[PDB]
Nucleic acid binder design. Sequence first.
DNA 1: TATCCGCTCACAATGCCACACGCGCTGCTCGGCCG
RNA 2: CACAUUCCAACCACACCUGGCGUGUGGC
Lengths: 417, 330
Amino acid sequence: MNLTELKNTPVSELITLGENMGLENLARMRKQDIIFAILKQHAKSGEDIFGDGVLEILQDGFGFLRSADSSYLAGPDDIYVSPSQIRRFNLRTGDTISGKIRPPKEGERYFALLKVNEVNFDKPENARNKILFENLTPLHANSRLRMERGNGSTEDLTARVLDLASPIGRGQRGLIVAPPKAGKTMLLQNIAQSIAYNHPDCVLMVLLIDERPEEVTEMQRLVKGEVVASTFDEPASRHVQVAEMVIEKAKRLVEHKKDVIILLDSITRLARAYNTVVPASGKVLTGGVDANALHRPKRFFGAARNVEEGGSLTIIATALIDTGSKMDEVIYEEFKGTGNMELHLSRKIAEKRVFPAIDYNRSGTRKEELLTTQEELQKMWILRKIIHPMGEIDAMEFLINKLAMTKTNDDFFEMMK
Amino acid sequence: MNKEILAVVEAVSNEKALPREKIFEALESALATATKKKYEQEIDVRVQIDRKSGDFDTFRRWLVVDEVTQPTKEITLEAARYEDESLNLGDYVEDQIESVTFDRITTQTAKQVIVQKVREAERAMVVDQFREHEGEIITGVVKKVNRDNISLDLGNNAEAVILREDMLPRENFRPGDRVRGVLYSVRPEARGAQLFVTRSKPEMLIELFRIEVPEIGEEVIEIKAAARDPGSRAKIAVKTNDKRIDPVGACVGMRGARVQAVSTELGGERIDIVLWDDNPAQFVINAMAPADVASIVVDEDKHTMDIAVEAGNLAQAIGRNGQNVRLASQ
DNA sequence: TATCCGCTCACAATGCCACACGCGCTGCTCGGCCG
RNA sequence: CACAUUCCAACCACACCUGGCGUGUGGC
């Protein structure tokens, strides 16, 4: 019995399964506890078990297998592994491990993985032979990640204008400078749907930090990808833990030569959490923000790169500006000159009912010629030349009108002639 | 001394829940309690710390009445000749000044009043900000369960209460799960439990509809009446302002899907949705569904509905604990 | 070569409580150096 | 395949401080 095929089942299904397994009324224990009791009985009936989970090595050296639905938390449904397996198969944080597991014993509180049959969708023999993510040589983005869907609906424009504003490729470093009341969640949903339709080969990773639960349940069953989030109902410890472990998973996937893309929202709240989780450094700058407190977020932002050997790690992080917060002000000030891909959204256009509120002149992409041929190069150059003298709102509405007049970017380029 | 009170008023973490004005009036109440504890008499007084100008002072309240007990707060209804009262009742004085507000007992009573009022202020703010949600479905995680009452964390220091009658006789929870419910009772002046949230009703089910049915919310299918035996049965009679919209065809759904979805969301509760009629006779004929009756005796003088069922449908017209009747009776 | 004698260095001269107090080759130059 | 450290419902464990040495004083 696999853990995913049992947990992604609805809660009522788990209740009926436990009741059919001859158990006490399962409406009392939590989902993790229900899974634990169900596995306990299903193993009491024999049934050599097959489990899976993302690995986390603690300070002692053992490993815990966390699950994706619980946003990588600690529960009775966790699988314990001794450091002997980590020394043998040469495991590390972020490596998803799947294999045979057994029932627990008295005094033990978690299951034990006996033998691994899959490490990051690979043979356990080749799991020890893999170049480190840090030893890789980063490069610029070369393969263009086209976001144009092709149906020309009222939502496809959201990606069309995107492709008309700043090209995006594998391993690109992305920032979303947008004030509140702007619809960043809509932009993230649109980009997730675009990457799920156009490029289903690369694994999609969407992360929501310090977010309201409604968006969490919306994203967990709207986009085609593994959605891990963390609401504000938990201290900054869980936030920084899930951040570190999702970036470790992404690093392991890239080491396995896989193109991963991490959508993060928001980098500002994540930096806030990283600031309040770290002890003081001795002194204080404006906004109550510590000096080294941004070292970990900055690293998280710099982990994105285009590997020359194989694989890529693209990141798109949304930032919170114009909130009247000294802390957010200094966070955006630090993060401004950090990435090579930026998208600025105008609040004045956002709350003017002109979607998507984009800023053309303020947004751009460094080394964009490596992500597009000369054709779209000259097309975007002409577009920028004609849009630079124009204003903000008038230019935005004119561009969105001329975009909705057609289906794709090619028809717009042709009508622009 | 004023430096200490300025430090304690600026060092407030939740300055929103307690701004300078109410913090200073809390300190006024604390100093009044301290002065009460100073003298063996029981005299109520005010402080008026002069928030932004300088240090504090004290007054003396009289509460003019014809009594004589505790003469520190006793002034007759006409003692307004000298000392410039000029009013019948409510005349107070600044007689007492020089109040010590730094000793051990003063500090203790100050801390006591401060913690009491920060509790009161967080209660007031949470109820004022989440009271308008009365009538809507909100989620939340429980944190403590007892044999008489359970607590719920909503977030941002928001605490909801669920009593015994607020829970079903067989529903179950434990700290960690996310349960949803509607807030029905609100007491912004309560000392403890504030957000009385539960479902325990069919109107809650109505709200569920408003969340799950996009048509419901614009009054496309009017819900007339509904009754619920908790975890046992849910009788409901609705009408339709339109003639092409079938309530038993639309609200129930396809092959009994929407009603079964609501049942499995509530934990397997038999729900009988029926069409409302403009006559109590046919209304109670249809309300006992599934059944078949051909006897109607309605009396508006005695409020009596004699609806005799055919022999054989008894176990279907009465049910367990008289459900098909006891709900229909209500 | 004895053997008494002297020198002188090493080993002693109860044993209980209560209270009080305290820091006398380390400061300035040459030699070291694996988380 | 195998040893296997299994990490923070009442409550058990998370408990405490100067004769080192000299001197001085007093009593038996």
